[PDB]
Amino acid sequence: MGSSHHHHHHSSGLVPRGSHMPVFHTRTIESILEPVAQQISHLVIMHEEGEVDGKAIPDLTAPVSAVQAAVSNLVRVGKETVQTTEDQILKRDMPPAFIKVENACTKLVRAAQMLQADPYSVPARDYLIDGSRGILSGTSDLLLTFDEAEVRKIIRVCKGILEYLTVAEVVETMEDLVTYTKNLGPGMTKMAKMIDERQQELTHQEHRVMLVNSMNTVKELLPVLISAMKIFVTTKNTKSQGIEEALKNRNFTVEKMSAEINEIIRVLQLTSWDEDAWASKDTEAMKRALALIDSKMNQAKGWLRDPNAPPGDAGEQAIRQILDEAGKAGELCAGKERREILGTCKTLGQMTDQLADLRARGQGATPMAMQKAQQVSQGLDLLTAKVENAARKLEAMTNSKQAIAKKIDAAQNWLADPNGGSEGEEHIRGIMSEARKVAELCEEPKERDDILRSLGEISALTAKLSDLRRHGKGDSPEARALAKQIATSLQNLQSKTNRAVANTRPVKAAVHLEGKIEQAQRWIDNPTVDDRGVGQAAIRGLVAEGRRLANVMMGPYRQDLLAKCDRVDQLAAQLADLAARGEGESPQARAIAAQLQDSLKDLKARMQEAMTQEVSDVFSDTTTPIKLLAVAATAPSDTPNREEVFEERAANFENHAARLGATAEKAAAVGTANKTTVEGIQATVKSARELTPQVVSAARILLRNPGNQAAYEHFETMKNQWIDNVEKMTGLVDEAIDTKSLLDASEEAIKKDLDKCKVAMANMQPQMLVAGATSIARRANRILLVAKREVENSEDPKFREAVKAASDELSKTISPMVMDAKAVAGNISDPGLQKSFLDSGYRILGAVAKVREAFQPQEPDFPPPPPDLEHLHLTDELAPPKPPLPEGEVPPPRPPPPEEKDEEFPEQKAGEAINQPMMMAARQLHDEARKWSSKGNDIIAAAKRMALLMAEMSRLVRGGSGNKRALIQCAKDIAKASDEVTRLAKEVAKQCTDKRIRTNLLQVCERIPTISTQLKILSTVKATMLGRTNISDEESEQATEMLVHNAQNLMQSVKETVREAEAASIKIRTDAGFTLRWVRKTPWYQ
Template structure:
């Protein structure tokens, strides 16, 4: 199948597809209307010349390239294109003698399809070779990052910086050129974000190495903390470069069915494990290697990554991976302790090192197996998602044809794959039981439809029983909507989704109440209990068959009113927590800086530092927890929530590094390198926290903040000050966001507009490919299904892009009204495409 993930490939394939589509139309006119095909000698000669030129350039490239994979993959593509071109020439010659020749028409279609497919293969092989060039540069940087572990003098640091700089510049330039070439906006964003992170971390890395070198050479204190800072930055940069390598190899993007984040997290963990394994094995093989060396750090990183994978698994598999990682961690401690005592070459130490080495291999195998299973399960879930709409349409249509039944059979096949992969016997049994029920209902419904009884009450009951249940919502607004649907019609069987949403809201309310003062806690808990009581009443009435009666309607109305009050109290509680925590985010880190720079003769210097370090860590933890709660309780969209979660994770990772940098400064008073390093780490932490708090405060949850603040009646000057301070912070953030609003709107609007012509071109190419397969007997069923699937998905992506363009255009046309009486509006300018 053709691929067009770069603008170059697309620009070459598009005119080829255009010409082939004309040939297909002429072929169909001859087949259906009996028209003679005109003389094609001239256009086919032009195609032959273009193909010959492409093959010649390809062969010259193969002769000079050192890429063994390219030398292997190019010849089959050459043969494919040349064979197709020969068929096309033969077809033109035969049609010149007999414009009605059936064999010539077959040659015409087969040759056209072969040229399009072969040209795509050639271009893809070229493109893959270019990607491998970039990956080689990225891997070179990855390897050179590990050299940071042996930099022990300022001369080494100068040499290291001089060597690293050009490589980083080259990688950044290649990534920038590559992202501009890509047609998938999502891939471009991922590459740019990862590359920007690497650029931001580069000065942090140099600062970390510098402070390590200065403390080590001056026999100063804090070498261990400096080592942690340096290793942390190296790991972060390595992870981002590995992510760049992964994204570079992607060639497709489905708007609706992208692989789950768990699968991608497992792949990243596997890449990290693979990159650290050789270093870990070298440390284990050397009985004289010291504890704390990079090799031991590599082992601990491998175990950490394996633990992350284990947390993503379930049941026995999770226990197995997590338990193995824990056991190997204990074994690592034993080996390290023996080597610290100088007994690394003893038989016991050698045996334990061998056991640890073998255990790492076993653990890696388990992690790889878990990743394969999760990827297979994700594939099955995506296949189900692609067919579910067709199945639902068939269930809703009383006169639906057999294709809907085929969709359901395919769904059941994918469900069986998921059941086979499940480690939980109960879960497997539930899936198989549901499959049996669905298969039985589908068979009966098919019989009724074939008998012309698809619109009878019995058939409608079968269709409703076969309908997919709604998945429980995660965030506040989603739960409110699901609860509202159930309250509007409690007699309708929604598989318990509405009541589950209500219970989730109550649980969230109680969790928020636990953090409130006693005076406010009782009010929120009382509303939670009232909602629970009314829900139980309504559920009981529905179970008795009185869900549509006057009593049920009265209870439902009372429940709706109480639920609104609960939502208001939850938002009020969350607003108060945000105002308490976010009103001052940087004072603890500033106090930590003051403690770290205290004069050596200051009283209780170290004790004060430890207290302020603990306060800073506690404050950072509260910031992250509050941001996560605000994201969960609020109505923020998915991208905003993910941004908050990423910023929280980054801030949590940086917090201990800031403390380590501060401790280095404390132990080395007056050291300029230590001061500069601490400032670098501190500023990076502040930047992350500002992003985290800014996204949280400006999420959809805080759109209702004005009303919540008005409802708060400050009882003293302290509360009034906090409330006013929060409003000032919000005003600053809103002003900052709106200053960038014009640029952001333009950027997003251009991106969605750009996707329409891009996907339209791709749809045209895929339509041509599919057209060359119609009625052909020499096409495999798998190839035909793949072409159809790609065509359908591309059409869906095009429709989604059109919807997004309409939405963004509507957003750009909104008039902003102000209390002062002024009105701001967007004025249409000349469109970008004219």
């Protein structure tokens, strides 16, 4: 190849974008590559038709022509694209892509002519895989470039309205305001329109939701940004004191919209899986932790200030709340920024025990004990401030990453197309600028110091390049030969930078509870790679939620909860030590797999149980507080205490709203829900936190302006936009708790809260009636809401009507506590209080309990059958002779078929070379489908085959033979299986009367047709790259990662179709056709 002595040595410049991923992230791209790879697999199985038999590879002027015919049209506009429209990045990128296309469909007709002439020809079996792969890589890169532009149009339009929200600060005159709407309007419909059209085209749903959610927030925040500018221009007069509550209600609206438009822009440039999501998740979580602390700080800084000793439940559990929530934040840190923060938690954790013991000893004013309570006060300051750090460092570190990305666009347009000017130069100053922010918000000696080196060297080159341009030499064999050298190090910058982001995110776990159990419950497999990591790191954040949950409880339950937390942790730290010994081999570690795997299963039941109570209490009244800020802020007339009363009602509203979100997370964290209802609830919780201040600012603007409507306009727009989050918060929270068990807690709550009305008279208070019917008012109104949700959700008229009935016989029974406790408010007129109050009020609890029974089994009855027929032993005399006049007589014959078996796993190990994640993907689907009989049940049947082929593909990858034709069939079979699962999973859902069960089943099983289509393409590829050429062998190492993470998804997404399919099996229609057989596998059901 190297065509001279001197020059061909330095020239390492075929290096713009020459080792790229394949992409199938749009319906167009998927539709093109699906057949291309279909066609190209033949020629990768014909290339193996000169190995097995070593035989002649037939006439290819028909196959390789229809191959050419496929990607012919694609360049017949792909050349007509590049010269026509003035796209700069399209121009330099479009050709070297389709130079590899035509390279192929040429290089397949050169090697076709080698075998058309000589059907035995190895100079073409040299150049067939190099010729094939080309057309795959080529068209991938060709279709990709074509798309990157369709996106660039959009990010353009978006970046525009990002820049146009800035000019919100330059808007003073009501005259100008409505001309802002005039010229914002048209440029938002085109964005929403551009986005909506683009989402349709997307394969990864994961993405389509982040888009669809983000752009909706944007729409619910014009009605607000519109408002906020009007109450900023309304307040331009000598009578407008608190003028800036508007300005910050208005800049909240501009920041959040801007953080959504940015989230949209980022999500749009996604071509594959998403690694940068997690940093916003954790960043949110710490804001959530900090917030909860911020609230409970002074409520327990007064604990330490005060010598007087109440060491129990009042504001000691206020201090340990902080220390749990700051412990939870430190968890989401990595390295030793984590170890410090948790290190401070266990120090100030024992200093409190030191004190709390000393407070029982009356030692409140002892000179060491006052001093020690001083230390904890200074401790919480430091710990709150050290979490406030790690929090904004994680946001700042990612904001810098998201900032480097949207610039490297035009930074590569400056660095090659050798003019740019001032306009282009700033794009590489800008990226260098951020690399320094990473390094100073990094916390290692050697991690920052390596970046400052890279930054120090791109500094020198970029100064040299800059001055050559300036002293003419901009067009020269030094102005390109160097400016080459830079784009190399400017890629190296994103390495050392992105590596610095990835070193501040720790071994992550499931966001939902039932996920976190699997990641742990999957220590039936005691020895494995990075399950020392994630297997503990779930169990770690499961007990750390048990601990978090017990620290806002009564002392009896509390220690009862921590007793389980500490004995589970103990049986897990046991096999943590036991497994590492040599292996946690079957004998001893069986003893824990009966105790811990069943113990950990009760800790859940104790966490949910409790969580169910804290939701039953806290969510009973979502509105009283902000409904008291309405009547407070309105201010019936004038008593100057108004300000201080509005504060106490506005503080009650912040105290309470903070509680709702803190509980809302606690249900997301520990309950029923999928990852989707958990994420749902969290966005809710994030908006409650954000909006709460924003309402009270508008609620202030009302106190200072008695008579204004424009103030009342902002109140109701904010007041409702906070409710429209809460009513939603409450929708996603009940959905994530057992309804049967919610109705228990709430019945038990109405019982206890009835007594407080019985013994409101027996004590004698007239309002403790009305406060003990603030409960049974909103509580009984909540049990009707919870049943109104379930009837909207069901399609089983037999259930639907039994609960629509027990609803009736309670909705009316709001009388004998509204206009009944209203009558005898003050009265103790014994006969005329209790004759209608207790009588009809305890039949209210009788109705509640009929509503409960409407959920309890409809079809099945109480007494089952025990069949004990004492089989005796009266012997049978069936004596066998053979008769005289005929000959040869016996029972029937035996054909080939068997008795019964079931093909369990070829669990490969002992000096074998496999893909360790791929097998571990395959062994996990098996485990789930292994549970169930495959006998009336092609879904389990399929699932079991799918996970068998995915163990073959695990052994059909590493090293590898001349079995490329095998890897094509293995992945061909896997696709065909998956299509059966999808066939059946749809028929199940279609028969299922529970809509949340149905919908969440279609959502996990409609992933599978695409995922398997991709797995086919990746399999047709990697085949072509199976131990071949030397430059090939650094692509064939990164190209597994895609296929690996693509196999992980299929096994996971099929595993959840199996479960949800069985789930949706149970609640099936009355006269329903399709039903598969769900029977757990026993010794007696194989």
